[PDB]
């Protein structure tokens, strides 16, 4: 009895993700793509990279 298995696969992943938090004075702030504002001065951003 002859039993034969053959298998091939390819995958690729590439690109970037972005989110951040910006604060203007005490009274104002904005959260981009994130549940909450970072209690933080100025601005911060993150650029996750996959390749």
């Amino acid at each position: 009895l002859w039993i034969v298995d053959l298998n091939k696969s390819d995958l690729e992943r590439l690109g970037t993700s972005w989110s951040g938090s910006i604060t203007i004075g005490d009274k104002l702030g904005v959260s981009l793509n994130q549940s909450s504002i970072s209690t933080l001065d100025g601005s911060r951003f993150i650029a996750a990279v996959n390749a």
């Binding site: 994130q34 909450s36 970072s38 993150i46």
Partner: protein, 79 residues
Amino acid sequence: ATPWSGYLDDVSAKFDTGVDNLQTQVTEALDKLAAKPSDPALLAAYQSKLSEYNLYRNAQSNTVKVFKDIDAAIIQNFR
């Protein structure tokens, strides 16, 4: 991802953000005093700053420890 933080480290951070610059002032004063150790203007200043920093840290650590004990006492009762 945002750096994850709990409750206790946020109560801790409240003090660090309460004292706006004391952390740096304490070094600046030391720097100039070390430059001229016998100057009495500098001495009374550094005395003030250091006496402030000492109470700052003490009150911080103690508050954290009490808020830990209140949580451990509740978590024990889950059984």
